[PDB]
Amino acid sequence: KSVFVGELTWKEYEARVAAGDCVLMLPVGALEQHGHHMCMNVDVLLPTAVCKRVAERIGALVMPGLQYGYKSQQKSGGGNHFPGTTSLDGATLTGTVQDIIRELARHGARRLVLMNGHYENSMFIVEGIDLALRELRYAGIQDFKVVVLSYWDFVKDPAVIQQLYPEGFLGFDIEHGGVFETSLMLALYPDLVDLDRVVDHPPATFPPYDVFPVDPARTPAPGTLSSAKTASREKGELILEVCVQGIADAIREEFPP
Amino acid sequence: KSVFVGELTWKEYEARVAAGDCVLMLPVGALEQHGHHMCMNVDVLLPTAVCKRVAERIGALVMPGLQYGYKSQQKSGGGNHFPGTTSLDGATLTGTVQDIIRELARHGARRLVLMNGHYENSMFIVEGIDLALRELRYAGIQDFKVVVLSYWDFVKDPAVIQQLYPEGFLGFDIEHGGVFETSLMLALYPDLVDLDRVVDHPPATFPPYDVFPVDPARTPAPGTLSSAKTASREKGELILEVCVQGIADAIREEFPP
Amino acid sequence: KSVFVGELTWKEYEARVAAGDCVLMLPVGALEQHGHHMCMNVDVLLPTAVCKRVAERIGALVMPGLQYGYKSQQKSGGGNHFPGTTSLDGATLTGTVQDIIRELARHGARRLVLMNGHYENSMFIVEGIDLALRELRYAGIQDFKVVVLSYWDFVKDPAVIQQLYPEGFLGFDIEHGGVFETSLMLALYPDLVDLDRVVDHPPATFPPYDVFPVDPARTPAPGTLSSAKTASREKGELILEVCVQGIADAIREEFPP
Amino acid sequence: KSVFVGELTWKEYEARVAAGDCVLMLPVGALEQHGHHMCMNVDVLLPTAVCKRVAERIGALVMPGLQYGYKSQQKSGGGNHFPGTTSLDGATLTGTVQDIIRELARHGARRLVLMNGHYENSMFIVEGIDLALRELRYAGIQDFKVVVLSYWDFVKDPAVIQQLYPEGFLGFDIEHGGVFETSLMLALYPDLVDLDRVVDHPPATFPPYDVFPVDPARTPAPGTLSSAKTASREKGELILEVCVQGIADAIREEFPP
Amino acid sequence: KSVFVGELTWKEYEARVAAGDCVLMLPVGALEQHGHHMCMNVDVLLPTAVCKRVAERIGALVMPGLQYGYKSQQKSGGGNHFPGTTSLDGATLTGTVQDIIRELARHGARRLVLMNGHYENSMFIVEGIDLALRELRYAGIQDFKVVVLSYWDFVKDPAVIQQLYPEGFLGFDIEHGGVFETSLMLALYPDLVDLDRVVDHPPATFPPYDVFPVDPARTPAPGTLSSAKTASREKGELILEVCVQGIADAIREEFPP
Amino acid sequence: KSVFVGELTWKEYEARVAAGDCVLMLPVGALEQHGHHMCMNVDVLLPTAVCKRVAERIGALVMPGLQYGYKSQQKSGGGNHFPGTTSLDGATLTGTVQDIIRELARHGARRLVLMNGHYENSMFIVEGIDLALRELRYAGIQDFKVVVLSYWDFVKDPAVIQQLYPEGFLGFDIEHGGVFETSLMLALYPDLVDLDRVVDHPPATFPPYDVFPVDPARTPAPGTLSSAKTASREKGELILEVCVQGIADAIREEFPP
């Protein structure tokens, strides 16, 4: 009926897990400012959309996504001084991932794909996985396998990059509310993007270090780390296809039928 | 426009908070089995739906809802031994609520309505609020106000109850996947309900005590605590309006514009 | 000798546990204001007294009671803003329950009755039990059984309620320092109750929601949620025999020799 | 007319704290094996008894005692491998002390005397105090003062030691269930002591290091670290009076009127 | 005398802090496998050596370094399945950083440079800083400034990269026990590096995702992610001067006299 | 050729552990003021020096030492109000010890000697050990043995004490920056001691209780608890050999081949 676990009855879910090779996917996002031109739930919407499409291709199921993520960092997300951005402490995010894995194992599930959509989440997701696997080991369970990834890492083909950045690629480091996400949003949730509001400032540049308390003067006023002026639905559809295809293939490789 | 914070840009959010009487609403649900006839994200869908309607009428905003809640208890949700049900440890839920309040305070927001949709969440939501307010006090903030409630508590009117349970009301204690929720779902998400699957068993009853480890034999096989056979969109619509109107008035009273 | 573990030598205790079917009882109370007419250790004294009597009747033992419980809530205990009331954070209470169960398992005990006397403790006791049972499982122990209850839940019989509330029962929700506890104290510790100090105010009434920071104005001045003016030692003796008999029978059922 | 906070109404407590010079005392014990001749709640009973007598002489109030303490260590309490002994994890004890100090400060109290009765508790009580004071500081409170002491430390005077130990004193290192404690119990709770069970074994001695997992063979079979055969009521009455007087003086010195 | 705080008397340290503009530097490393050719304390030795030289150049002091860091990750450090590697859980590392910052603030210090030498530590160092700064804020301190950096990030000049990697720079992703660290060790601790033990395997290549439990088969047998065959003392001297010069300038900029 | 794990390659370490009888030693110190005449890293340097010499004699290996320890206490370290002293919270130190033991067990190691050099660390090291052993049990490991000791406890022989304190030994209670440690430092790191700066003040003494917030006036201005004027290299060389020999024998006794 649906690839979303939340829309299934427990009997339907139980039956899918009973199959023996059931793959579950968990989107991990954040509520974070994304400039003057885009909504703040982008980091949840994108990995969730990708999960949905991948799940439909490989016959997987998608768990409710984590709506709040780790604190936004200046050099990757603009900084946690912006209003709207609502961040969790590291222990909180870590504990959430850990609890979910513990429960999935209780269900009998043994295959999980954690799809991150918020850069800063990475290491806390990692600690959550480790702490959960540690407990499972104490419970005599060592066959639970986890694949963790950030969907954008699948866009590495030079050909695609050239098509996405005709004037050259500066790296994902400045991709917060920039061309990459804005394009994907234009292809998935266009009504949540107001391109005319984009502030066309030069790419953010930082020295090889970080400063705390976060200094607002060091992040472009709009919150974006690069201009999304050249973003488009076409680019978004290209990104989506590349991500969906590459991830579906990776999951097939790691969790063969 | 949208009443969902996640769909706003940080500038739009900032402007609403800048108004001075901005009311924020946070749905807190769970992924929990709800019988053979209904999906598992009910505890998220319902309080979120009520929040949306209330927010539209009073000019409030709704934060992304918490998808996972505390462990299901036998006497209220059937028990955490059911597959599908994916629960958090108490410290995790408490920490999530606490972090969000801390961040909302940072934004300059001072009015929050926590709408619970999962009975078992209550005390951990309470602790999250207390710990957060304790920190705000240390930070020199004492004007942050929180109103917490479970939407179903607003169905008090005997006339309404009579209209909802023409055969006599047995209490909310057995209302897990029963008439109350099923009726709401029939009016909001009919495609996520199939009354034909309803197992018409007698209302669950228990002795005045609890037993751990949870014993599956003490919970009706389907997971429901009462039959939803008499559920109807009509009953659902009545319930919805009653809750929306009552909650809207409660908020107008506690957070006068 | 005694039914109190603290009054036994480790040799005696060891011998009792060696019986193989030894039942242990742990009272969990609190230090909380109980109006102008009763002392603040009521939530410890009452469950302890019930445990003592039940333990004597069925041959069980009683562990030292927890003297401090979770934060008093307005709608059930008046609120944590009252002086005298000395509350623990949830993690502290949960951890205390968890540590004790771990230790009892180490002793070889496998049967525990947790008798709550402070309404607000419930869910934290529940979490303590779950976390402890989780650990025991990792330790290879799955035969530890726990029965958790609040002594007042055993007073259900309409004929009993009738005698206790001839003018009509309004529910346990207003029973903080009211007729129920005051009657029990009059029968158990008359010297710690001064009925002449009772403030006969109308029953506390609240809207279908909760407000934080707790608003002192919403709780009856004396701290009571209802008047104990009609309390009596005779009503207390009835309540005691009903609770002792009901609980004793419950334990015989769950923990047969 | 009680010195115990638990036996006072919140109004009586409030009035005493309103004096502005109220001294509060918190007994901290443990449930620990104490040989074949004595009960296990000794570490709670003694400091409580001393607190009662001191409070009566200086006009102080006594808080409910902590019934469970830190894990028993071989060289001082016999070891945590003994049945009956029910110990808390360090974080639990620390958190308990921290929570109480926070609440007492909320009451407006500013003078606390923690009376330890279980040697192993010391450092966790210290951490609890430090964490609480750090927190009070954030709340703008720096006038909260705490005095921590173990009643036995007030038995210094060689003259007194002479009477207690004629054949020479050997330090409190082996004073667990020995002459010192048994004598106090014979004077306070003789019904909880049976010298006819005292195993007259040689004083326990250990190498200059500790071993974990704890080795049972390194602790005298009885659980005691020294024989209490020569214990007596007379000796107890001596110790008691010396401790009560000495401690009362110290409190008058630290919390001068 | 020495730039190491540990080798100063508390009087000397106090005098330096009393200067009002004293900069403290804290090396954060790890105990981790570094192939067959280098010792396991490299992540401590390197940042410490850089701090030493930077401190001497701009007159700062160096705090004792953190010897244990976060769990080694496959794609960055080879994996935590290797023997020798001794890692801390995230909460432990975060808490250590938090504690030290709190203490330095107590000293009156307000300038800190956290120099990371183990890639995986980064986000836990960040959380330590945030939690510590949050507390300081509660204490009324908002003038404590922190500069966090990984020393290798200062080697970015194209001309410098060309010299170090004439064949072509493949990126820092594969720099664990490779050319970069080995060259530095050759120049700083030649006796702890045996280049003749280097296993000249192809650069480690990984798909755009991570797998847990870590699969030993996915990491080159030696533990290195790239061959240090072309490492040299001369390349090390170049890296050292670039790092020391770049970092010293950064500190002069962020912490002017 | 090195006894330090940090200076070994993972292969060398692996080989030593593969033997099956490898003994590991973990120095646990602190950064703490030690008067006007000595450096602050003393508590790390001494236990480490002893570990090195013991390891060389019995064939053990020395892990990187813990540089930061628990808060300094007035009666033993002068107090945590002194500048320079940088202390961890109890949970942090406990967690660090716990994580290391967990990792060593993962390596296959099963014999650990924890050598404390900072008195105040004791109980938190104990808790870390207990929590780790508890975890190991859940993992099916019960053959991990730990020996905890403070190197100064092996210096008790009257013949030795006589030479060290020919004028009378007052106990280790006042041994903070006194003759004992200063003598060891004069023998191991004379450059880190300026005996001319010693403040020949009378031995510190305190009432039989503690006060918090710590009162500065109760600690000798210098920070020392006893004058080290009597210190000498010869005395240190005596202590060193005594400890090294005693500890080596103790280890041979507990971890026999």
Ligand SMILES: C[As](C)(=O)[O-]
């Ligand atoms: C830099 As991002 C995709 O977490 O906004």
Ligand SMILES: C[As](C)(=O)[O-]
């Ligand atoms: C008892 As319910 C509304 O949380 O499923």
Ligand SMILES: C[As](C)(=O)[O-]
């Ligand atoms: C509501 As009550 C029995 O915990 O005071």
Ligand SMILES: C[As](C)(=O)[O-]
């Ligand atoms: C050594 As004791 C007084 O804590 O039993």
Ligand SMILES: C[As](C)(=O)[O-]
């Ligand atoms: C990748 As590294 C410098 O932490 O070994």
Ligand SMILES: C[As](C)(=O)[O-]
């Ligand atoms: C009393 As000490 C050796 O920890 O300074």
Ligand SMILES: [Mn+2]
């Ligand atoms: Mn993001």
Ligand SMILES: [Mn+2]
């Ligand atoms: Mn529910």
Ligand SMILES: [Mn+2]
């Ligand atoms: Mn109560």
Ligand SMILES: [Mn+2]
């Ligand atoms: Mn004891």
Ligand SMILES: [Mn+2]
């Ligand atoms: Mn590393």
Ligand SMILES: [Mn+2]
């Ligand atoms: Mn020390």
Ligand SMILES: [Zn+2]
């Ligand atoms: Zn984003």
Ligand SMILES: [Zn+2]
């Ligand atoms: Zn529901």
Ligand SMILES: [Zn+2]
């Ligand atoms: Zn009560």
Ligand SMILES: [Zn+2]
């Ligand atoms: Zn004792």
